[PDB]
Amino acid sequence: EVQLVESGGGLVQPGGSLRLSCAASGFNIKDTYIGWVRRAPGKGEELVARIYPTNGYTRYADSVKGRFTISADTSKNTAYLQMNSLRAEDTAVYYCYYHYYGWHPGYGLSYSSGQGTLVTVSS
Amino acid sequence: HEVVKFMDVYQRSYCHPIETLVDIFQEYPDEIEYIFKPSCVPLMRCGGCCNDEGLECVPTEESNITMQIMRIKPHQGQHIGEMSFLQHNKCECRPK
Protein backbone atom coordinates (compact mmCIF):
# COMPACT_ATOMS: atom_id res chain seq x y z
CA GLU A 1 0.00 0.00 0.00
CA VAL A 2 1.52 3.27 -1.20
CA GLN A 3 0.80 6.56 0.51
CA LEU A 4 1.81 9.99 -0.69
CA VAL A 5 1.51 12.55 2.12
CA GLU A 6 1.38 16.11 0.74
CA SER A 7 1.90 19.44 2.53
CA GLY A 8 2.90 23.07 1.96
CA GLY A 9 0.17 24.74 -0.07
CA GLY A 10 -1.68 27.98 0.57
CA LEU A 11 -2.36 31.53 -0.58
CA VAL A 12 0.34 34.08 -1.40
CA GLN A 13 0.82 37.43 -3.11
CA PRO A 14 2.88 37.69 -6.31
CA GLY A 15 6.61 37.36 -5.62
CA GLY A 16 5.82 35.21 -2.60
CA SER A 17 6.83 31.59 -1.98
CA LEU A 18 5.73 28.15 -0.75
CA ARG A 19 7.54 24.90 -0.06
CA LEU A 20 5.67 21.71 -1.03
CA SER A 21 6.65 18.37 0.40
CA CYS A 22 5.62 14.86 -0.52
CA ALA A 23 6.43 12.10 1.95
CA ALA A 24 6.10 8.66 0.38
CA SER A 25 5.63 5.29 2.03
CA GLY A 26 5.20 1.80 0.61
CA PHE A 27 8.05 2.16 -1.86
CA ASN A 28 11.54 3.60 -2.23
CA ILE A 29 11.76 6.93 -4.02
CA LYS A 30 15.18 6.09 -5.45
CA ASP A 31 13.30 3.57 -7.58
CA THR A 32 11.14 6.30 -9.12
CA TYR A 33 10.72 9.55 -10.87
CA ILE A 34 9.02 11.62 -8.20
CA GLY A 35 7.69 15.14 -8.90
CA TRP A 36 4.67 17.41 -9.32
CA VAL A 37 2.14 18.08 -12.00
CA ARG A 38 -0.37 20.91 -11.90
CA ARG A 39 -3.87 21.53 -13.24
CA ALA A 40 -5.00 25.17 -13.51
CA PRO A 41 -8.55 26.47 -14.20
CA GLY A 42 -9.46 25.09 -17.64
CA LYS A 43 -6.02 23.73 -18.56
CA GLY A 44 -4.61 20.24 -19.07
CA GLU A 45 -2.18 18.58 -16.66
CA GLU A 46 1.36 19.92 -16.96
CA LEU A 47 4.58 18.53 -15.53
CA VAL A 48 6.01 21.05 -13.09
CA ALA A 49 9.21 19.38 -11.87
CA ARG A 50 10.71 15.93 -11.38
CA ILE A 51 13.71 14.24 -9.84
CA TYR A 52 15.27 10.75 -10.10
CA PRO A 53 16.64 10.49 -6.59
CA THR A 54 19.11 7.76 -7.56
CA ASN A 55 21.32 10.42 -9.21
CA GLY A 56 19.52 13.77 -8.77
CA TYR A 57 18.69 14.34 -12.43
CA THR A 58 15.86 16.86 -12.57
CA ARG A 59 13.50 18.30 -15.13
CA TYR A 60 11.37 21.49 -15.10
CA ALA A 61 8.48 23.07 -17.00
CA ASP A 62 9.81 25.90 -19.14
CA SER A 63 7.53 28.34 -17.30
CA VAL A 64 9.10 27.73 -13.87
CA LYS A 65 12.78 27.52 -14.80
CA GLY A 66 14.76 29.76 -12.45
CA ARG A 67 11.93 30.04 -9.89
CA PHE A 68 11.12 26.52 -8.58
CA THR A 69 13.62 23.97 -7.28
CA ILE A 70 12.94 20.31 -6.64
CA SER A 71 15.05 18.23 -4.30
CA ALA A 72 14.77 14.94 -2.39
CA ASP A 73 15.93 13.56 0.93
CA THR A 74 16.17 9.81 0.41
CA SER A 75 16.62 9.07 4.14
CA LYS A 76 13.14 10.52 4.78
CA ASN A 77 11.74 9.13 1.54
CA THR A 78 10.47 12.67 0.89
CA ALA A 79 10.63 15.14 -2.02
CA TYR A 80 10.40 18.94 -1.79
CA LEU A 81 9.43 21.72 -4.17
CA GLN A 82 10.65 25.23 -3.34
CA MET A 83 8.46 27.67 -5.26
CA ASN A 84 9.96 31.15 -5.51
CA SER A 85 8.77 34.37 -7.13
CA LEU A 86 5.25 33.05 -7.62
CA ARG A 87 2.93 34.61 -10.28
CA ALA A 88 -0.83 34.65 -10.82
CA GLU A 89 -0.60 32.00 -13.58
CA ASP A 90 0.96 29.55 -11.13
CA THR A 91 -2.43 29.29 -9.48
CA ALA A 92 -3.35 25.61 -9.71
CA VAL A 93 -3.78 22.36 -7.84
CA TYR A 94 -0.34 20.77 -7.56
CA TYR A 95 -0.19 16.97 -7.33
CA CYS A 96 2.74 14.91 -6.12
CA TYR A 97 3.27 11.93 -8.42
CA TYR A 98 5.69 9.10 -9.06
CA HIS A 99 6.29 6.32 -11.49
CA TYR A 100 8.84 3.51 -11.34
CA TYR A 101 11.94 4.26 -13.34
CA GLY A 102 12.11 2.29 -16.60
CA TRP A 103 10.10 -0.92 -16.81
CA HIS A 104 7.83 -2.00 -14.01
CA PRO A 105 6.92 -5.66 -13.86
CA GLY A 106 3.38 -6.91 -14.21
CA TYR A 107 -0.05 -5.47 -13.67
CA GLY A 108 0.37 -3.62 -10.40
CA LEU A 109 0.33 0.14 -10.09
CA SER A 110 3.40 1.72 -11.78
CA TYR A 111 2.38 5.42 -11.68
CA SER A 112 0.39 7.27 -9.03
CA SER A 113 -0.41 10.67 -7.57
CA GLY A 114 -1.75 12.36 -4.49
CA GLN A 115 -4.84 14.23 -3.36
CA GLY A 116 -3.30 17.59 -4.39
CA THR A 117 -2.39 20.82 -2.62
CA LEU A 118 -4.00 24.11 -3.58
CA VAL A 119 -1.69 27.01 -4.50
CA THR A 120 -3.27 30.45 -4.98
CA VAL A 121 -1.47 33.62 -6.09
CA SER A 122 -3.61 36.76 -5.62
CA SER A 123 -3.44 40.52 -5.11
CA HIS B 1 -2.02 17.22 -60.96
CA GLU B 2 -3.10 18.54 -57.56
CA VAL B 3 -0.44 20.96 -56.22
CA VAL B 4 -0.47 21.76 -52.49
CA LYS B 5 -0.89 25.51 -51.89
CA PHE B 6 1.88 27.54 -50.28
CA MET B 7 -0.10 28.60 -47.18
CA ASP B 8 -1.11 24.99 -46.61
CA VAL B 9 2.44 23.65 -46.73
CA TYR B 10 3.47 26.61 -44.60
CA GLN B 11 0.96 26.15 -41.76
CA ARG B 12 1.30 22.38 -41.78
CA SER B 13 5.06 22.29 -41.48
CA TYR B 14 5.36 24.87 -38.73
CA CYS B 15 6.62 24.01 -35.23
CA HIS B 16 3.97 22.02 -33.32
CA PRO B 17 3.22 18.76 -31.49
CA ILE B 18 2.94 15.85 -33.92
CA GLU B 19 2.53 12.08 -33.43
CA THR B 20 6.06 10.74 -33.31
CA LEU B 21 7.31 7.17 -33.00
CA VAL B 22 9.90 7.11 -30.27
CA ASP B 23 12.41 4.36 -29.61
CA ILE B 24 11.93 3.18 -26.04
CA PHE B 25 15.53 2.20 -25.37
CA GLN B 26 16.79 5.65 -26.32
CA GLU B 27 14.50 7.07 -23.57
CA TYR B 28 15.55 4.43 -21.02
CA PRO B 29 18.97 2.99 -21.91
CA ASP B 30 19.73 1.10 -18.72
CA GLU B 31 19.21 -2.67 -18.89
CA ILE B 32 21.08 -3.43 -22.13
CA GLU B 33 20.28 -7.15 -21.85
CA TYR B 34 16.54 -6.63 -22.29
CA ILE B 35 14.53 -5.71 -25.34
CA PHE B 36 11.09 -4.08 -25.38
CA LYS B 37 8.09 -4.91 -27.46
CA PRO B 38 7.08 -2.82 -29.11
CA SER B 39 10.54 -1.30 -29.27
CA CYS B 40 9.00 2.11 -30.02
CA VAL B 41 5.95 4.02 -28.69
CA PRO B 42 3.66 6.69 -30.17
CA LEU B 43 4.17 10.04 -28.43
CA MET B 44 3.12 13.60 -29.18
CA ARG B 45 6.42 15.41 -29.71
CA CYS B 46 7.43 18.84 -31.07
CA GLY B 47 8.31 18.75 -34.74
CA GLY B 48 8.37 20.81 -37.88
CA CYS B 49 10.33 23.90 -38.73
CA CYS B 50 10.86 27.46 -37.52
CA ASN B 51 12.08 28.91 -40.80
CA ASP B 52 15.02 30.61 -39.18
CA GLU B 53 18.32 28.77 -38.81
CA GLY B 54 18.59 30.37 -35.34
CA LEU B 55 15.42 28.91 -33.85
CA GLU B 56 14.47 25.38 -32.87
CA CYS B 57 11.08 23.90 -32.02
CA VAL B 58 11.14 22.83 -28.40
CA PRO B 59 8.52 21.66 -25.89
CA THR B 60 7.26 24.28 -23.40
CA GLU B 61 4.56 22.15 -21.86
CA GLU B 62 4.83 18.46 -21.09
CA SER B 63 2.82 15.63 -19.56
CA ASN B 64 3.16 11.97 -18.54
CA ILE B 65 1.72 9.03 -20.40
CA THR B 66 1.79 5.42 -19.18
CA MET B 67 1.69 2.29 -21.38
CA GLN B 68 1.83 -1.51 -21.16
CA ILE B 69 5.07 -2.82 -22.66
CA MET B 70 6.47 -6.37 -22.94
CA ARG B 71 9.98 -6.94 -21.74
CA ILE B 72 11.99 -9.76 -23.27
CA LYS B 73 15.11 -11.64 -22.32
CA PRO B 74 15.81 -13.02 -25.81
CA HIS B 75 15.50 -16.83 -25.47
CA GLN B 76 13.55 -16.70 -22.21
CA GLY B 77 9.95 -15.49 -21.91
CA GLN B 78 8.22 -12.19 -22.53
CA HIS B 79 6.54 -10.41 -19.60
CA ILE B 80 4.01 -7.61 -19.41
CA GLY B 81 4.73 -4.43 -17.46
CA GLU B 82 4.37 -0.68 -17.55
CA MET B 83 6.44 2.34 -18.57
CA SER B 84 5.85 6.07 -18.52
CA PHE B 85 6.95 8.73 -21.02
CA LEU B 86 6.73 12.49 -21.64
CA GLN B 87 4.54 13.97 -24.35
CA HIS B 88 4.77 17.55 -25.52
CA ASN B 89 1.55 19.52 -25.04
CA LYS B 90 3.01 22.72 -26.46
CA CYS B 91 5.90 23.75 -28.68
CA GLU B 92 7.65 26.89 -29.69
CA CYS B 93 10.53 28.36 -31.63
CA ARG B 94 13.34 29.52 -29.33
CA PRO B 95 16.95 30.76 -29.75
CA LYS B 96 19.41 27.86 -30.16
UniProtKB/Swiss-Prot annotation, chain B:
Disulfide cross-links: 15-57, 46-91, 50-93
Residues bearing attached sugar chains per UniProt: 64
Induction statement: By hypoxia. Regulated by growth factors, cytokines, gonadotropins, nitric oxide, hypoglycemia and oncogenic mutations.
Tissues of expression: Higher expression in pituitary tumors than the pituitary gland.
Top-level taxon: Eukaryota
Family: Belongs to the PDGF/VEGF growth factor family.
Associated disease: Microvascular complications of diabetes 1: Pathological conditions that develop in numerous tissues and organs as a consequence of diabetes mellitus. They include diabetic retinopathy, diabetic nephropathy leading to end-stage renal disease, and diabetic neuropathy. Diabetic retinopathy remains the major cause of new-onset blindness among diabetic adults. It is characterized by vascular permeability and increased tissue ischemia and angiogenesis.
Annotated protein name in UniProt: Vascular endothelial growth factor A, long form
Organism: Homo sapiens (Human)
Shown segment, full-protein numbering: 218 to 313 of 395
